[PDB]
Design a protein around this ligand. Structure first.
Ligand SMILES: Nc1ncnc2c1ncn2[C@@H]1O[C@H](CSCC[C@H](N)C(=O)O)[C@@H](O)[C@H]1O
Ligand SMILES: Nc1ncnc2c1ncn2[C@@H]1O[C@H](CSCC[C@H](N)C(=O)O)[C@@H](O)[C@H]1O
Lengths: 374, 392
């Protein structure tokens, strides 16, 4: 009867919370949260039904963090076992560099309860936006500073590297003095050399915060005045030193063919813009108010989504503002039909021509989603 | 009336992944340019907007270079910025992950002296961690595109988590999306992991009607016709570690960690050996829970309505944030519900003072003792935030 949902608050105070998460906060029976700033904390409390618990109460200066984490999981699990519909909220993404979330979800499931995790905005998400790089260009390795040292890993200088928790190297309690930071520096020196530059990143949590994105040569990382800047909030971005060369054999096997802002190619693209006409008519959105209302409700109201999934035809029949085609599409409970009814050709719209049941039902689920990784 | 450019994401799931700051900007922006994957998200953007919007996907066409399309996408945004409009661009997922026109527009805007910002959104990777239930930190996590992995002749490291994007269209974009080169990725997987190792095929649900795909396949299976048929343009692979590196006791020693550290942090997916949920160490922590008393009294949130109202406003209203930043003292003086202490803290425009006025000891609250101006001003920014949720 009890259940567990664990969601995130993101990084920036209030702004990074997702719409589905705010909806959960408003409806939940009980909220356990671990956030980093008072404005976010207050915002969660004030939007809630008023039954909440601060998970950070389990930390202590010289207490092993592992003990705190087990306790955080346990208070959530106790309420699940008691039959509450429990929401956990963790700073950032609740599954990224978080021990108690995955633990609680696994244990809940093992014991036969419904449990799920929702994504949130992570520190890496914030970093890509703030530092303005695309991880897909060379590939991107994520690692925790202590973990990489305890397992004697080497960093690959051909890719993007992101190193988290640089401010807590070798610490298992809550005392952070940078006493072992020099061990990470040694790793960096060996893998990248002394002249390679890294970026020290701290994304702005409060309005009063200023984004930190300072560059430091590795040769400067043992300086007292540099060292002092690395806190428990700090992440390092280490750009590639030596991207791996293209292999022409691989390119060929893949069937692939063998800077100024406004070069000739760009100037051509711009000149052609105002007159460009597609080779074929593109569909535009064409959805009734009823359809839009329903689709928003299904996105933001779990109770309604549950009812829809249990009996889609019946649920469609509760929204009589839907067109006949919309009702049919919704009754099928498949993604493709939704695309067919909600997006139509302007030529057909002008002709009063509604999509046929054949057109609706024939929709391919797989290739309805247009992703040309822009 | 200077133009400005903000690029945001829609996230992956229809509507629900949009961030509060993003919705706020949808409502307030002069003009919105968007490229999203589903019609419910598209309609939601339109219906919440000031009604001036443009679908960037209109620039796509067969026999048209994608790059030309991207330059045009950047240009329509920049034109409106130059004209003095408050411009919002929105892309599927996170707008900086596999999106070329976003980075380009921001760079040019900044070069020409405009304020230009990217906002994070929920990525496919983010959705995967939540749906498949692993943490990149436990073993480390390498994320890369299938074609690029092959083109640069990279090896997959079997000791870490691996995420592979774009498995559904190896070696070709286009629209034909015939996965005729997929076997080259399978070869790579076979070489690095062997045939018996298991991968997960992941598709996160976009629409309410979508069902999450999280099927496990042995690498042996990836050549089977009934398996190949499953892979699509929204497919991602998760490859769990096969051979994680052991904890080095000498490294543990050098790090000053106790000799009791013999294992990394726990992964719960079932791909790794999974310790009992309630072993002796866990039972100890649970038994200690009810009677735990911290070494020193902990502060609790304690903030005025005026302070909370202001802090929400600054998070959600860029024009107000701009005003505050320009003159924090004058701004605080427009909110006379603030205490003298709050006004002072806000005037410093630093995070550390905020913690002093927005959190207080329950003992100090009971006695009615307010924090001193000296206490507020001496607050250390570098130790205000406590952010640590894993350990070895
Ligand atoms: N504001 C911020 N700027 C940069 N890195 C940050 C940050 N907040 C957290 N981090 C990173 O995250 C680590 C704490 S663990 C926090 C993880 C959180 N669930 C998330 O999704 O991000 C820090 O040591 C640092 O490496
Ligand atoms: N619904 C979905 N589920 C799983 N992976 C997805 C997905 N949609 C896209 N992807 C993955 O994402 C790759 C790039 S498209 C998505 C890019 C988006 N900016 C983001 O933040 O993630 C695809 O090739 C695929 O591997």
């Amino acid at each position: 009867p009890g259940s567990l949902t664990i969601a995130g608050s993101g990084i920036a105070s209030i702004g990074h919370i997702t719409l589905e998460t705010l909806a959960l906060i408003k409806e939940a029976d009980k909220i356990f949260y671990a956030v980093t700033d008072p404005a976010t904390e207050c915002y969660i409390q004030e939007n809630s039904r008023g039954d909440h618990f601060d998970l950070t109460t389990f930390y202590d200066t010289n207490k092993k963090r592992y003990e705190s984490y087990v306790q955080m999981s346990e208070v959530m699990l106790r309420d699940v076992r008691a039959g509450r519909n429990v929401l956990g909220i963790f700073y950032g993404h609740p599954g990224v560099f978080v021990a108690p979330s995955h633990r609680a979800i696994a244990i809940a499931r093992e014991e036969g309860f419904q449990a799920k995790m929702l994504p949130g905005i992570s520190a890496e998400d914030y970093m890509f936006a703030d530092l303005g790089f695309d991880p897909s260009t060379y590939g991107c390795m994520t690692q925790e500073a202590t973990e990489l040292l305890v397992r004697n890993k080497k960093l690959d200088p051909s890719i993007h590297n992101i190193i988290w928790q640089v401010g807590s190297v070798g610490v298992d309690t809550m005392v952070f003095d940078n006493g072992k930071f020099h061990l990470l520096v040694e790793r960096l020196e060996k893998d990248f050399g002394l002249d390679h530059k890294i970026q020290h990143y701290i994304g702005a949590i409060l309005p009063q915060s200023v984004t930190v994105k300072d560059t430091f040569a590795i040769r400067d990382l043992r300086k007292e005045e540099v060292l002092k800047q690395f806190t428990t909030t700090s992440t390092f971005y280490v750009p590639p030193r030596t991207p791996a060369p293209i292999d022409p054999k691989a390119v060929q096997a893949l069937g692939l063919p063998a800077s100024p802002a406004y070069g000739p190619d760009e100037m051509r693209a711009v000149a052609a813009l105002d007159s460009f006409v597609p080779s074929q008519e593109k569909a535009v959105v064409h959805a009734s108010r009823a359809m839009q209302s329903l689709m928003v409700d299904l996105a933001l109201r779990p109770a309604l989504l549950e009812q829809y999934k249990a009996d889609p035809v019946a649920f469609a029949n509760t929204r009589n503002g839907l067109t006949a085609q919309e009702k049919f599409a919704l009754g099928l409970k498949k993604p493709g039909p939704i695309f067919v009814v909600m997006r139509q050709l302007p030529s057909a719209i002008a002709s009063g021509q509604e999509p046929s049941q054949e057109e609706i039902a024939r929709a391919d689920d797989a290739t309805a989603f247009i992703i040309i990784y822009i």
